[PDB]
Amino acid sequence: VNSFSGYLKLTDNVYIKNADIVEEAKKVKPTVVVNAANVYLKHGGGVAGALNKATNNAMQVESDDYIATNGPLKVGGSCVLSGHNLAKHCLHVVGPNVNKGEDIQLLKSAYENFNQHEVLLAPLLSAGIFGADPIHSLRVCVDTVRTNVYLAVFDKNLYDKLVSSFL
Numbered sequence: 001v002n003s004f005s006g007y008l009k010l011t012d013n014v015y016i017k018n019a020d021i022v023e024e025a026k027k028v029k030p031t032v033v034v035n036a037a038n039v040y041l042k043h044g045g046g047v048a049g050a051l052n053k054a055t056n057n058a059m060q061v062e063s064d065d066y067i068a069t070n071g072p073l074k075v076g077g078s079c080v081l082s083g084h085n086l087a088k089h090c091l092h093v094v095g096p097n098v099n100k101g102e103d104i105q106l107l108k109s110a111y112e113n114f115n116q117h118e119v120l121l122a123p124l125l126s127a128g129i130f131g132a133d134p135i136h137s138l139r140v141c142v143d144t145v146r147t148n149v150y151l152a153v154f155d156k157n158l159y160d161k162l163v164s165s166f167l
């Protein structure tokens, strides 16, 4: 048993809810929250901007030190950093950004990072301002992630379309 509440069960391991991931993280304090990161860990907008704002910019300060030491992530890659006030850990995962012309085949590689963690609170990778079709992102998630993933979908309209179209 875990602390996640109000989720619809899609599969053995994937759950979904219409929820702001910031507010969900603040309530649950999960072991792992996933950020929709870019390779520079520049948390300007979308999920990343909202998570970083909720940490009072501490996520960005930590991220800048990480990049100064290690250089940029790979598209499809990830790093584990602090979860600050939101979670124990933040798994920063880089899905491909369609609005930059990145290979959508890298979305499966991105979701494979989730398998290193038994339970995660996450957004749909490459959705929102990353430009991919969220229906596709949910299909790749279900077909790739084997650990227990609690997906927060911010937009109520999109949530209802994801559920009602799910095979």
Ligand SMILES: Nc1nc2ccc(F)cc2s1
Residues within 6 Å of the ligand: 019, 020, 021, 022, 023, 045, 046, 047, 050, 123, 128, 154
């Ligand atoms: N407070 C929140 N802002 C965003 C922005 C984008 C998003 F996909 C999810 C959320 S939750």
